[PDB]
C-alpha cells in the first residue's frame, strides 16, 4: 500500500535545571529507524533498524549535524514563545514538531506535511498545498509572518516533494525484507461474566503489521458502538502490534454478536463469533 517517512521532534524546557530535553525519532511506516536523545551518551543520530545501519559515516555525520541544528532551533523557540505569551520562567513548556511525506503504492509523491505545537496543541501548520500556513492565534501569526518573510514554505516544499521521497524510496528498498511485509492478525475471542445476566465478549487481534486495523462489533449484522470498548493499538515489542475490542451483552444472547476484523493482511475481512 502507501508508505510514509515521518520525523518527530520534542523539546521540553527545564526551569532552573538547565538546557531543554530534546528527543528526535524517525519512522518509516510503523517502524522506527533512527533516534537522537539529549540524555544519551553519543550526542549523535543513532540507528534503530538494521537496514539503516549500513549507511556510511557521511550519512551519520550529516544527520547528526542537522538534528543538532533542529535541537538548537527548539531551544531558541522555547524562549521566543515564552516571550510571545509573556509566560514566567517558573514553568516547563513543550515544543513539538512533526514533518514528513507519503507516497502511494507506486511510490510516487502523494502528500507532504509539517506541523508545530506549543504545550500540546496546534501552533502553526503547513497547509495541504504546501504553499501557506495556518496559525492558531495572534502569537502564531507572528511566526507565520516571519516564515513568510523567510519563504520557509518554498524551501520546505522542495524537501517534502523531493528529498523526503527520495530518502523514503531508498529506505523502502534497503529495508524491503521487513518494511514491505504484511503480518496478518492472529485472532481469537474471550468471554467474562460481568454478573449473572451480563457478559463481556472480547475480540482479539495479535501479531499484526502494519499497525492500521479495524475491529468492529455487530449485533444481528448492525454496527454497535453502544456498550463497546476499544483499547489503543499497542506495540508487542517484536515489531508487531496488538488490539482488542469488547462489548457487554445480555447473557444468553452471545450468538447474535459478531466481531469483524479488517487488515491489509486479510483480503477477506474476518468474522468471529463466540463458539
Amino acid at each position: 500500500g502507501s508508505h510514509s517517512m515521518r520525523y518527530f521532534f520534542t523539546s521540553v524546557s527545564r526551569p532552573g535545571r538547565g538546557e531543554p530535553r530534546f528527543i528526535a525519532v524517525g519512522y518509516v511506516d510503523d517502524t522506527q529507524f533512527v533516534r537522537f536523545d539529549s540524555d544519551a551518551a553519543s550526542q549523535r543520530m543513532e540507528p534503530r533498524a538494521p537496514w539503516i545501519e549500513q549507511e556510511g559515516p557521511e550519512y551519520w555525520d550529516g544527520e547528526t549535524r542537522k538534528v543538532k541544528a533542529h535541537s538548537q532551533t527548539h531551544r531558541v523557540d522555547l524562549g521566543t514563545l515564552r516571550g510571545y505569551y509573556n509566560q514566567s520562567e517558573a514553568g516547563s513548556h513543550t515544543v513539538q514538531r512533526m514533518y514528513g511525506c507519503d507516497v502511494g503504492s507506486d511510490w510516487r509523491f502523494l502528500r507532504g506535511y509539517h506541523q508545530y505545537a506549543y504545550d500540546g496543541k496546534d501552533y502553526i501548520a503547513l497547509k495541504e498545498d504546501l504553499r501557506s500556513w495556518t496559525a492558531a492565534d495572534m502569537a502564531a501569526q507572528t511566526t507565520k509572518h516571519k516564515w513568510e518573510a523567510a519563504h520557509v514554505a518554498e524551501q520546505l516544499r522542495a524537501y517534502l516533494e523531493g528529498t523526503c521521497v527520495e530518502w523514503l524510496r531508498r529506505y523502502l528498498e534497503n529495508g524491503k525484507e521487513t518494511l514491505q511485509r504484511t503480518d496478518a492478525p492472529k485472532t481469537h475471542m474471550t468471554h467474562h461474566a460481568v454478573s449473572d445476566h451480563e457478559a463481556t465478549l472480547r475480540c482479539w487481534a495479535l501479531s499484526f503489521y502494519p499497525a492500521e486495523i479495524t475491529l468492529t462489533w455487530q449485533r444481528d449484522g448492525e454496527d454497535q458502538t453502544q456498550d463497546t470498548e476499544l483499547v489503543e493499538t499497542r506495540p508487542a515489542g517484536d515489531g508487531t502490534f496488538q488490539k482488542w475490542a469488547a462489548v457487554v451483552v445480555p447473557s444468553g444472547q452471545e450468538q447474535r454478536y459478531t466481531c469483524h476484523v479488517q487488515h491489509e493482511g486479510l483480503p477477506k475481512p474476518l468474522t468471529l463469533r463466540w463458539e
Binding site: 542537522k66 523557540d77 508545530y116
Partner: peptide, 9 residues
C-alpha cells in the same frame, strides 16, 4: 534523512 535545518519561530 531529515530536513537540512529549521527556521526559528
Amino acid at each position: 534523512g531529515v530536513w537540512i535545518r529549521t527556521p526559528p519561530a
